[PDB]
Every structure is written in structure tokens, then in C-alpha cells.
Structure 1
Amino acid sequence: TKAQPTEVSSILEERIKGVSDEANLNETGRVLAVGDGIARVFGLNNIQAEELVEFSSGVKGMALNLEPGQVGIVLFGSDRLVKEGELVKRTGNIVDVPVG
């Protein structure tokens, strides 16, 4: 069968418990699993493509894949302090650099 974060038991138990959404999936995100510097986040429905997102680990990332069930952030730093369930604030600013 299909793989969706309905599979993820912690998400699933909450859904069954009648707890869902509500500024968790706004811009607000939560890491489901982080491996290989490819965090897969459930939430961030307001995310603009390739946009810079700032974790609570503080690591910044871009979101090349806006997968239909997760947003596949690419971490710009080490996974040393990144781990599951991380709150992921959405910086809300497309990749830009100071110019002058």
C-alpha cells in the first residue's frame, strides 16, 4: 500500500485521537525522519517552492521537492544535531543573497 505520513504511527495515533493540523502544517513543519541530510517534513503547506526554511536545529534548507505528503528539505548543514520531530519554521524567503 501507499506510504503517507498516515503510516507514521505517532502521526496516526494523533489523527485517531482526533488531533490534527491547525498551524502545525501552516508554516510550522515537523520532521518525520531525517536521514542523509534529506529531512522529510510533514507540514509547511504554505511553503513556496525552493524556499529557505529554518529548523529548530537552526540548520537552513531549501525545499526542492514538494512531495504530496512531505516536503523534502535539503539540509545545508550536518545532521549532527538534527533529529526527528524538529519544529521547522518557514523563513518565507526564496533564495536571495545581498547584492551591492
Structure 2
Amino acid sequence: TKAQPTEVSSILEERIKGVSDEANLNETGRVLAVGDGIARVFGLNNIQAEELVEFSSGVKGMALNLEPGQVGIVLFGSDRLVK
């Protein structure tokens, strides 16, 4: 049909499992699929546009795309750091 980023299986598995959001996803995120020097993160529902985020890998990035359900950070730094 169509593949929405929220229809990703890890996202879906949490959703079926009920709520698990709230700060975990409202002000922190957990990274999804990554590569191309941009990362697609789940959560960070509060996040200034062009905020600086610091990933757990040291690297920090500037949020570019605020999308409904995902944020696409742009990584200011090496991708070997990120996983």
C-alpha cells in the first residue's frame, strides 16, 4: 500500500504495546534508520527547529526536517560514531 515512517515495525511494536512515550519521545528521541549523513529519529516531540541535538555517540546535529512522527537530524560529524 504505502510505507509510512510510523508504520515501521519497531514503532508499531511499541504502539501495540500501548503508550511508552512522554519525554522518552517528547524531548528525547531514539534513532531509527541512519545513513546518508542524516538520521531519522523517533520522538523529540519538543525540539526547536534547527535545535542542536546531542546523540549518544557524542556527535551533535542540527534538526532540519520536522515531520509528523519523525525528525530528520543532519549530523555534524562522522557516521561511524552513529548506530
TM superposition score normalised by structure 2: 0.85
Structure 1 runs not aligned, ≥5 long: 81-98
* Greater relative contact order, per chain length (Cα 8 Å cut-off, separation 6+): 1
| Regions of 4+ moved over 6 Å | none
How far 1:64 moved relative to its partner? 1.4
- 2:14 alignment partner, SS class: helix
- Supply the RMSD in Å over aligned alpha carbons: 5.3
The count of aligned residue pairs is 82
- 1:6 alignment partner, SS class: helix
Question: What does the per-residue CA deviation read over 1:58-91, in whole Å, with 9 as the maximum and x for residues that have no partner?
Answer: 10100111112211100011110xxxxxxxxxxx
How do 1:1-80 and structure 2 match up within 5 A?
1-80=1-80
Greater displacement, 5-14 / 69-78 = 5-14
1:41–1:72 CA contact under 8 A, matched in 2: yes
Q: Which has the larger radius of gyration?
A: 1
Identity percentage over the alignment? 99
How far 1:56 moved relative to its partner? 0.2
TM superposition score normalised by structure 1: 0.72
Q: Which has the higher helix share?
A: 2
Question: What does the per-residue CA deviation read over 1:28-48, in whole Å, with 9 as the maximum and x for residues that have no partner?
Answer: 111111111110011111101
